Amino acid sequence: GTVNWSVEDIVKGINSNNLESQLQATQAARKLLSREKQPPIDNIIRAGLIPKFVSFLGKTDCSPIQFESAWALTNIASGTSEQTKAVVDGGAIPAFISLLASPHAHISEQAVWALGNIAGDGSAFRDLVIKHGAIDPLLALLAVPDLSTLACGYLRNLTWTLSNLCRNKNPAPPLDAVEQILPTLVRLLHHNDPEVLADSCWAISYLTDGPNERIEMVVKKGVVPQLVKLLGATELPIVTPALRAIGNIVTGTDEQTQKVIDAGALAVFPSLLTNPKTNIQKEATWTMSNITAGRQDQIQQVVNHGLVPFLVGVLSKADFKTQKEAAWAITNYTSGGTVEQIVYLVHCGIIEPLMNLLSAKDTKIIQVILDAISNIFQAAEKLGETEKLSIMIEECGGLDKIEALQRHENESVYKASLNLIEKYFS
């Protein structure tokens, strides 16, 4: 009967000179800390029980108390940064790394979980876990010919902990640690378990969220095709991280973006840009805006895949944040595209939704829209069709909005709107 003990009784049992009494009190603490309703983490810390639990982690001759203390410390480290710090201050990191080699699978799994919570606190504890040498034993746990031989929950916890070791920035994980972990991540990215795939994609998304040198590290491993395949998955928990990773990769060089295009990613965007989940639509439009900012042949690839109508649709109706990303994609398109591509964009019906979005209350969207207008007008000038475009913008009510923007707080807004009125409507 280790249910509903008091912290006083737990302290009494742990302070006894009896290993079994300590085990029973530690189990009672674990059950207290594993309750969904307000676990008394702070009361357990104030009682000074963390050093005892950490010392129990090293009792190799009593694996049950090792497991119970590891579980208790895992739940303590799952709380606030101060509580995770309390666990780290007790010396738990090296003790958990030692437990990673335990012959009992459930004890090593608990150690993996605990290290995941500690690393997940932030960059400092992540790097400290790495400095204590956790990556080597962690990856050794996955050194099997077929990952399907490992228990499902075991593999899921290992993947989650590895993802936390790739997470957080300022600073990002050490380059050498990323190179150490990446091959195992690639292997996990081909596992059939949805949660393992979701956490592997999340890890890749963390690693691709950075400079082009970090993006290049990931792309060199040839994971882009697999990311695109997972981008076409049905499980939203997999698509979300895969889209974030692909979006992070297209923020890099035009050659890295091209590697994304060559894998067939654009063929999936018809569904992503119409996805019922607002965040998928927003992230997809943000990826498109970073693709339309590339070379003209890449804009042409966007055109050939029939994605301009989908951008027009998102600009016409979507969450405002998605509409903003679409406005960005249009401005990038018009800034880097040919006259023929900018003419095709107009022929697809961009002007009317572009105008309708000039009634928004966000200064940035208005600047973005008005810069796309300028680019389209420049293309019209190059074609000598400025009057046509002028008539079109006037027929849909854009003229009134631009004239009304001449009297706007932001200076860039009234100067550009006044330059447009004077250069094309006088």
Binding site: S34, W71, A77, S78, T84, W113, G116, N117, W160
Partner: peptide, 7 residues
Amino acid sequence: RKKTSDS
């Protein structure tokens, strides 16, 4: 992201 082990 941290996870509490409830069971």
